[PDB]
Amino acid sequence: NRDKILAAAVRVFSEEGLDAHLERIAREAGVGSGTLYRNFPTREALIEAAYRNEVARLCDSVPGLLAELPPAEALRAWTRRFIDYATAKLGMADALRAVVASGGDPYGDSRQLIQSALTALMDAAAAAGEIRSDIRSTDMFAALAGIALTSSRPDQRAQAERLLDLVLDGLRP
Amino acid sequence: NRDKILAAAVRVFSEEGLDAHLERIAREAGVGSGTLYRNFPTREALIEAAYRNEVARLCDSVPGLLAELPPAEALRAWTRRFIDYATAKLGMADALRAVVASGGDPYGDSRQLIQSALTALMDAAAAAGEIRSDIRSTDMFAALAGIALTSSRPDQRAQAERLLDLVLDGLRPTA
Ligand SMILES: [Cl-]
């Protein structure tokens, strides 16, 4: 419902930019525009909420991934989700740029939250002996950030996947 | 510098709500007020950032706590940090309201982030056999929230510690 509105926000802001038709987001989410407005009264609030929700969905996937997969495989799956997040962030670049230029702070403590999710994955994989234990999570984060910077476009997805494979291979015991 | 400002903001807004003077926050953070205005050009932007920082610090303590303590004791230490957060939240009630009434949203996905931190703690403690595995993290969240609502005054400190003990005892395994 909320997740539906904010998923729709990512899509519509990515396609239409800052000037997106808000009624389109409501309708795609199967919701009235009064409902959209009661929850997200300004377009900047909606943009920021959509960004924050991408961040939270990425971070909050970790316990479930660790529950279902061996920890190095959990880390690998999560790195794909990190690129999905990067591709989303890039998709709504014009919208996020506008919120910042108008005085907003969509980002807040997102970098720390994402770093901590990575630390949780890497501590579990290192404890299991599935990865080396001497790599810092802050350096892995920088590696993923660079792959985001070079390879976040939808058309760069194969290169992004191969670069993720290379960095994950750098973690091998 | 930012962590300092934001920590000071939470402290001052939770104590004084909207009577908070920005000069007091700058002072406690040890920074010049121009520096504070440069970074947070609006009182509501300061309040929102302070709240979000408080949530993220609470969530991000989980890996480190699980690295240093047996997982049920990690859970216990973190639940005290949760009550610290929820007490601050209650104290910042007027300030958080003012962020809303200007069309902003301090809360975002905070509930989800904090519930997930709780899930991480409870998953580890159940895997280790140190707690039962059949309690829901949304229920544990509501239990801790309730303690913050009943037992937030400085004179209720000991009660809050006893309620935390009671809730953690409800988590005890069969064997
Ligand atoms: Cl944040």
Side-chain angles (χ1 to χ4, degrees), chain A residues 14-22 24-58:
Chain A
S14 299
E15 188 193 353
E16 306 191 19
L18 189 270
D19 301 358
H21 275 73
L22 307 172
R24 196 200 183 184
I25 296 166
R27 180 63 55 88
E28 279 180 22
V31 112
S33 75
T35 296
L36 184 45
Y37 180 71
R38 284 189 318 263
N39 297 112
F40 302 107
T42 65
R43 73 176 51 240
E44 317 84 83
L46 182 63
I47 287 158
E48 167 177 297
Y51 175 81
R52 286 175 69 178
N53 180 250
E54 284 273 348
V55 171
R57 287 177 13 243
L58 178 60

Short mmCIF file of all heavy atoms in Angstrom, two decimals, chain A residues 14-58, unseen atoms left out:
data_model
loop_
_atom_site.label_atom_id
_atom_site.label_comp_id
_atom_site.label_asym_id
_atom_site.label_seq_id
_atom_site.Cartn_x
_atom_site.Cartn_y
_atom_site.Cartn_z
N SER A 14 11.33 8.29 -12.20
CA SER A 14 12.40 7.89 -13.13
C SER A 14 12.06 8.17 -14.61
O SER A 14 12.92 8.64 -15.38
CB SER A 14 12.76 6.41 -12.92
OG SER A 14 13.24 6.22 -11.58
N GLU A 15 10.82 7.88 -15.00
CA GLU A 15 10.35 8.09 -16.38
C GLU A 15 10.09 9.57 -16.67
O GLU A 15 10.48 10.08 -17.75
CB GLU A 15 9.08 7.27 -16.63
CG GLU A 15 8.57 7.24 -18.06
CD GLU A 15 7.16 6.68 -18.14
OE1 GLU A 15 6.69 6.20 -17.08
N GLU A 16 9.45 10.26 -15.73
CA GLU A 16 8.96 11.64 -15.94
C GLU A 16 9.79 12.76 -15.30
O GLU A 16 9.60 13.94 -15.63
CB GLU A 16 7.51 11.76 -15.48
CG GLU A 16 6.59 10.76 -16.12
CD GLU A 16 5.13 11.07 -15.87
OE1 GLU A 16 4.79 12.22 -15.52
OE2 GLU A 16 4.30 10.15 -16.08
N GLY A 17 10.71 12.41 -14.40
CA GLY A 17 11.49 13.42 -13.70
C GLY A 17 10.72 14.12 -12.60
O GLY A 17 9.64 13.66 -12.17
N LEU A 18 11.25 15.26 -12.16
CA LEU A 18 10.71 16.01 -11.01
C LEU A 18 9.27 16.45 -11.27
O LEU A 18 8.44 16.48 -10.34
CB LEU A 18 11.59 17.24 -10.71
CG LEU A 18 11.35 18.07 -9.43
CD1 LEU A 18 10.35 19.19 -9.64
CD2 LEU A 18 10.95 17.23 -8.20
N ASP A 19 8.98 16.75 -12.54
CA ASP A 19 7.64 17.19 -12.99
C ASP A 19 6.60 16.08 -13.16
O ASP A 19 5.60 16.30 -13.85
CB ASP A 19 7.76 17.89 -14.34
CG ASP A 19 8.66 19.09 -14.30
OD1 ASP A 19 9.18 19.43 -13.21
OD2 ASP A 19 8.84 19.68 -15.39
N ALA A 20 6.84 14.91 -12.58
CA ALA A 20 5.93 13.77 -12.70
C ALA A 20 4.48 14.11 -12.33
O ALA A 20 4.23 14.89 -11.40
CB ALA A 20 6.42 12.63 -11.83
N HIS A 21 3.53 13.53 -13.06
CA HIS A 21 2.11 13.62 -12.71
C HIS A 21 1.86 12.80 -11.45
O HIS A 21 1.80 11.55 -11.52
CB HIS A 21 1.22 13.08 -13.83
CG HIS A 21 0.91 14.06 -14.91
ND1 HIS A 21 1.83 14.48 -15.84
CD2 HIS A 21 -0.25 14.67 -15.24
CE1 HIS A 21 1.27 15.34 -16.66
NE2 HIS A 21 0.00 15.47 -16.32
N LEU A 22 1.70 13.47 -10.30
CA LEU A 22 1.40 12.71 -9.05
C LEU A 22 0.16 11.81 -9.13
O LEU A 22 0.11 10.74 -8.50
CB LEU A 22 1.26 13.65 -7.86
CG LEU A 22 2.45 14.60 -7.68
CD1 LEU A 22 2.10 15.64 -6.58
CD2 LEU A 22 3.72 13.83 -7.33
N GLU A 23 -0.83 12.21 -9.93
CA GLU A 23 -2.04 11.40 -10.05
C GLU A 23 -1.72 9.99 -10.62
O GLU A 23 -2.39 9.00 -10.27
CB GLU A 23 -3.15 12.13 -10.84
CG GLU A 23 -3.07 12.03 -12.34
CD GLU A 23 -2.28 13.18 -12.96
N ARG A 24 -0.70 9.92 -11.48
CA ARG A 24 -0.21 8.67 -12.08
C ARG A 24 0.35 7.69 -11.04
O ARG A 24 0.13 6.47 -11.13
CB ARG A 24 0.87 8.99 -13.09
CG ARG A 24 1.16 7.84 -14.01
CD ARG A 24 2.52 8.00 -14.65
NE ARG A 24 2.79 6.92 -15.60
CZ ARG A 24 3.93 6.76 -16.26
NH1 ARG A 24 4.95 7.59 -16.06
NH2 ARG A 24 4.06 5.74 -17.10
N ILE A 25 1.06 8.24 -10.06
CA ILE A 25 1.64 7.45 -8.99
C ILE A 25 0.52 6.91 -8.13
O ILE A 25 0.49 5.71 -7.85
CB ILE A 25 2.65 8.29 -8.15
CG1 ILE A 25 3.83 8.69 -9.04
CG2 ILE A 25 3.09 7.51 -6.92
CD1 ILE A 25 4.73 9.77 -8.47
N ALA A 26 -0.42 7.77 -7.74
CA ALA A 26 -1.56 7.29 -6.95
C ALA A 26 -2.28 6.14 -7.67
O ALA A 26 -2.54 5.07 -7.08
CB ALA A 26 -2.53 8.45 -6.67
N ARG A 27 -2.60 6.38 -8.94
CA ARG A 27 -3.41 5.46 -9.73
C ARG A 27 -2.69 4.13 -9.94
O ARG A 27 -3.28 3.08 -9.78
CB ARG A 27 -3.77 6.10 -11.09
CG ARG A 27 -4.60 5.26 -11.97
CD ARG A 27 -6.00 4.93 -11.39
NE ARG A 27 -6.76 6.13 -11.02
CZ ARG A 27 -7.57 6.81 -11.84
NH1 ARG A 27 -7.74 6.45 -13.10
NH2 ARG A 27 -8.19 7.89 -11.36
N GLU A 28 -1.41 4.20 -10.27
CA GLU A 28 -0.60 2.98 -10.37
C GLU A 28 -0.57 2.17 -9.09
O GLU A 28 -0.54 0.92 -9.15
CB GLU A 28 0.80 3.29 -10.86
CG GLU A 28 0.77 3.44 -12.39
CD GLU A 28 2.15 3.74 -12.98
OE1 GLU A 28 3.19 3.44 -12.32
OE2 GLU A 28 2.16 4.30 -14.11
N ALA A 29 -0.65 2.86 -7.95
CA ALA A 29 -0.67 2.22 -6.65
C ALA A 29 -2.08 1.83 -6.22
O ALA A 29 -2.27 1.32 -5.11
CB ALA A 29 -0.05 3.15 -5.58
N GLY A 30 -3.07 2.09 -7.09
CA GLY A 30 -4.45 1.72 -6.81
C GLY A 30 -5.03 2.52 -5.66
O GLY A 30 -5.84 2.01 -4.88
N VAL A 31 -4.64 3.79 -5.58
CA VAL A 31 -4.97 4.64 -4.46
C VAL A 31 -5.52 6.00 -4.98
O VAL A 31 -5.17 6.42 -6.08
CB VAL A 31 -3.69 4.75 -3.57
CG1 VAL A 31 -3.09 6.13 -3.57
CG2 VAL A 31 -3.90 4.12 -2.20
N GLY A 32 -6.38 6.66 -4.20
CA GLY A 32 -6.91 7.98 -4.57
C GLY A 32 -5.87 9.07 -4.38
O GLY A 32 -4.88 8.87 -3.67
N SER A 33 -6.05 10.23 -5.00
CA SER A 33 -5.03 11.29 -4.82
C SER A 33 -5.14 12.01 -3.45
O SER A 33 -4.17 12.58 -2.99
CB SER A 33 -4.98 12.27 -5.99
OG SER A 33 -6.09 13.13 -5.93
N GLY A 34 -6.31 11.95 -2.81
CA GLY A 34 -6.48 12.39 -1.42
C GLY A 34 -5.63 11.51 -0.50
O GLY A 34 -4.94 12.00 0.40
N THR A 35 -5.67 10.20 -0.74
CA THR A 35 -4.86 9.26 0.02
C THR A 35 -3.37 9.51 -0.17
O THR A 35 -2.60 9.50 0.81
CB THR A 35 -5.23 7.81 -0.34
OG1 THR A 35 -6.58 7.59 0.06
CG2 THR A 35 -4.35 6.81 0.38
N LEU A 36 -2.96 9.73 -1.43
CA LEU A 36 -1.54 10.00 -1.72
C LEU A 36 -1.12 11.22 -0.92
O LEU A 36 -0.12 11.19 -0.17
CB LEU A 36 -1.28 10.21 -3.22
CG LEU A 36 0.20 10.41 -3.68
CD1 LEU A 36 1.13 9.40 -3.03
CD2 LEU A 36 0.30 10.31 -5.21
N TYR A 37 -1.94 12.27 -1.04
CA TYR A 37 -1.68 13.57 -0.41
C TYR A 37 -1.65 13.49 1.11
O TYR A 37 -0.84 14.16 1.74
CB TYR A 37 -2.71 14.62 -0.86
CG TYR A 37 -2.52 16.00 -0.25
CD1 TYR A 37 -1.44 16.83 -0.63
CD2 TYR A 37 -3.41 16.48 0.72
CE1 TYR A 37 -1.27 18.10 -0.07
CE2 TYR A 37 -3.25 17.74 1.28
CZ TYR A 37 -2.18 18.54 0.90
OH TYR A 37 -2.06 19.79 1.46
N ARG A 38 -2.54 12.70 1.71
CA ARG A 38 -2.54 12.59 3.18
C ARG A 38 -1.26 11.96 3.70
O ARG A 38 -0.78 12.31 4.78
CB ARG A 38 -3.76 11.82 3.70
CG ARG A 38 -5.04 12.66 3.68
CD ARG A 38 -6.22 11.97 4.40
NE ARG A 38 -6.30 10.54 4.10
CZ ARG A 38 -7.08 9.98 3.17
NH1 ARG A 38 -7.91 10.72 2.43
NH2 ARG A 38 -7.05 8.65 3.00
N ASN A 39 -0.69 11.06 2.91
CA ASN A 39 0.54 10.37 3.31
C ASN A 39 1.82 11.09 2.93
O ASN A 39 2.81 11.05 3.68
CB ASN A 39 0.53 8.95 2.76
CG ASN A 39 -0.60 8.13 3.33
OD1 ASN A 39 -1.53 7.76 2.63
ND2 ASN A 39 -0.55 7.88 4.62
N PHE A 40 1.78 11.78 1.79
CA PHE A 40 2.96 12.42 1.19
C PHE A 40 2.46 13.74 0.61
O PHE A 40 2.09 13.79 -0.55
CB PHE A 40 3.54 11.53 0.08
CG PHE A 40 3.93 10.15 0.58
CD1 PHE A 40 3.16 9.03 0.25
CD2 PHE A 40 5.01 9.99 1.43
CE1 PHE A 40 3.48 7.76 0.76
CE2 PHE A 40 5.35 8.72 1.94
CZ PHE A 40 4.59 7.62 1.61
N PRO A 41 2.39 14.77 1.46
CA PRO A 41 1.74 16.03 1.07
C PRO A 41 2.47 16.87 -0.01
O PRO A 41 1.86 17.71 -0.66
CB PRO A 41 1.64 16.79 2.40
CG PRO A 41 2.66 16.21 3.29
CD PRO A 41 2.90 14.79 2.84
N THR A 42 3.77 16.65 -0.19
CA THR A 42 4.51 17.44 -1.19
C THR A 42 5.26 16.47 -2.10
O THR A 42 5.56 15.33 -1.70
CB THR A 42 5.53 18.41 -0.57
OG1 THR A 42 6.56 17.68 0.11
CG2 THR A 42 4.86 19.35 0.44
N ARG A 43 5.59 16.93 -3.30
CA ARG A 43 6.35 16.07 -4.17
C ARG A 43 7.73 15.82 -3.63
O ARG A 43 8.24 14.73 -3.81
CB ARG A 43 6.31 16.52 -5.65
CG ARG A 43 7.10 17.71 -5.98
CD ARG A 43 7.06 18.00 -7.53
NE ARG A 43 5.68 18.01 -7.99
CZ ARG A 43 5.18 17.20 -8.92
NH1 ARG A 43 5.94 16.32 -9.57
NH2 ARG A 43 3.90 17.30 -9.20
N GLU A 44 8.32 16.79 -2.92
CA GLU A 44 9.65 16.54 -2.32
C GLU A 44 9.55 15.49 -1.23
O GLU A 44 10.46 14.67 -1.11
CB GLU A 44 10.32 17.80 -1.74
CG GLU A 44 10.22 19.03 -2.61
CD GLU A 44 8.89 19.78 -2.40
OE1 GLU A 44 8.75 20.60 -1.42
OE2 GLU A 44 7.98 19.55 -3.21
N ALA A 45 8.48 15.52 -0.43
CA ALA A 45 8.33 14.46 0.60
C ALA A 45 8.21 13.09 -0.04
O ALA A 45 8.79 12.13 0.45
CB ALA A 45 7.12 14.71 1.50
N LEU A 46 7.45 13.01 -1.15
CA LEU A 46 7.26 11.75 -1.86
C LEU A 46 8.59 11.22 -2.43
O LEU A 46 8.87 10.04 -2.34
CB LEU A 46 6.22 11.90 -2.97
CG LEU A 46 5.90 10.63 -3.77
CD1 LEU A 46 5.28 9.60 -2.83
CD2 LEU A 46 4.86 11.06 -4.82
N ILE A 47 9.36 12.11 -3.05
CA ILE A 47 10.67 11.74 -3.63
C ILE A 47 11.56 11.20 -2.53
O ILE A 47 12.19 10.11 -2.68
CB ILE A 47 11.36 12.97 -4.25
CG1 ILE A 47 10.65 13.35 -5.54
CG2 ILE A 47 12.82 12.66 -4.63
CD1 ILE A 47 10.88 14.81 -5.98
N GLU A 48 11.67 11.98 -1.45
CA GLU A 48 12.52 11.59 -0.31
C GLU A 48 12.03 10.25 0.28
O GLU A 48 12.85 9.37 0.62
CB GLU A 48 12.56 12.68 0.76
CG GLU A 48 13.18 12.15 2.07
CD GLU A 48 13.33 13.19 3.19
OE1 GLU A 48 14.08 14.16 3.01
OE2 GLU A 48 12.72 12.99 4.26
N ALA A 49 10.72 10.07 0.41
CA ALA A 49 10.18 8.81 0.99
C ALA A 49 10.50 7.62 0.11
O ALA A 49 10.81 6.53 0.60
CB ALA A 49 8.67 8.92 1.25
N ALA A 50 10.40 7.83 -1.21
CA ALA A 50 10.69 6.77 -2.16
C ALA A 50 12.16 6.35 -2.08
O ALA A 50 12.49 5.15 -2.09
CB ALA A 50 10.37 7.22 -3.60
N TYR A 51 13.03 7.36 -1.98
CA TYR A 51 14.45 7.08 -1.84
C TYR A 51 14.70 6.31 -0.52
O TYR A 51 15.39 5.27 -0.51
CB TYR A 51 15.28 8.40 -1.95
CG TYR A 51 16.74 8.07 -1.67
CD1 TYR A 51 17.58 7.52 -2.68
CD2 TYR A 51 17.26 8.26 -0.38
CE1 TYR A 51 18.92 7.17 -2.35
CE2 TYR A 51 18.59 7.89 -0.06
CZ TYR A 51 19.38 7.33 -1.05
OH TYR A 51 20.70 6.98 -0.74
N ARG A 52 14.16 6.83 0.57
CA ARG A 52 14.35 6.20 1.88
C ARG A 52 13.82 4.77 1.90
O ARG A 52 14.39 3.88 2.53
CB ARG A 52 13.62 7.05 2.95
CG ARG A 52 14.43 8.34 3.19
CD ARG A 52 13.72 9.32 4.17
NE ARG A 52 13.65 8.85 5.57
CZ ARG A 52 13.12 9.55 6.57
NH1 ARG A 52 12.53 10.73 6.35
NH2 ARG A 52 13.13 9.04 7.81
N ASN A 53 12.71 4.55 1.20
CA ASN A 53 12.14 3.19 1.14
C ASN A 53 13.03 2.21 0.35
O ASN A 53 13.12 0.99 0.70
CB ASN A 53 10.74 3.28 0.49
CG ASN A 53 10.04 1.92 0.39
OD1 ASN A 53 9.87 1.37 -0.71
ND2 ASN A 53 9.63 1.38 1.52
N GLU A 54 13.70 2.70 -0.70
CA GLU A 54 14.66 1.86 -1.47
C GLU A 54 15.78 1.44 -0.52
O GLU A 54 16.21 0.29 -0.51
CB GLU A 54 15.25 2.59 -2.71
CG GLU A 54 14.30 2.69 -3.90
CD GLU A 54 14.36 1.47 -4.83
OE1 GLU A 54 15.28 0.64 -4.71
OE2 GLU A 54 13.47 1.35 -5.72
N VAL A 55 16.26 2.41 0.25
CA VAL A 55 17.37 2.19 1.20
C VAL A 55 16.92 1.18 2.25
O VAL A 55 17.62 0.20 2.51
CB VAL A 55 17.84 3.51 1.88
CG1 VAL A 55 18.83 3.24 3.03
CG2 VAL A 55 18.54 4.42 0.84
N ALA A 56 15.73 1.39 2.82
CA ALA A 56 15.28 0.49 3.87
C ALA A 56 14.99 -0.92 3.37
O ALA A 56 15.36 -1.89 4.05
CB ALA A 56 14.03 1.07 4.61
N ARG A 57 14.41 -1.04 2.19
CA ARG A 57 14.19 -2.37 1.62
C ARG A 57 15.49 -3.12 1.36
O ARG A 57 15.56 -4.33 1.62
CB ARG A 57 13.29 -2.32 0.37
CG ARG A 57 11.81 -2.02 0.76
CD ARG A 57 10.94 -1.88 -0.58
NE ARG A 57 11.70 -2.38 -1.73
CZ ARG A 57 12.09 -1.65 -2.78
NH1 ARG A 57 11.75 -0.37 -2.92
NH2 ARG A 57 12.81 -2.23 -3.71
N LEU A 58 16.49 -2.41 0.86
CA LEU A 58 17.83 -3.01 0.68
C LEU A 58 18.42 -3.48 2.03
O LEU A 58 18.88 -4.62 2.17
CB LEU A 58 18.75 -1.95 0.06
CG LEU A 58 20.21 -2.38 -0.15
CD1 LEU A 58 20.32 -3.61 -1.10
CD2 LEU A 58 21.00 -1.15 -0.68
#
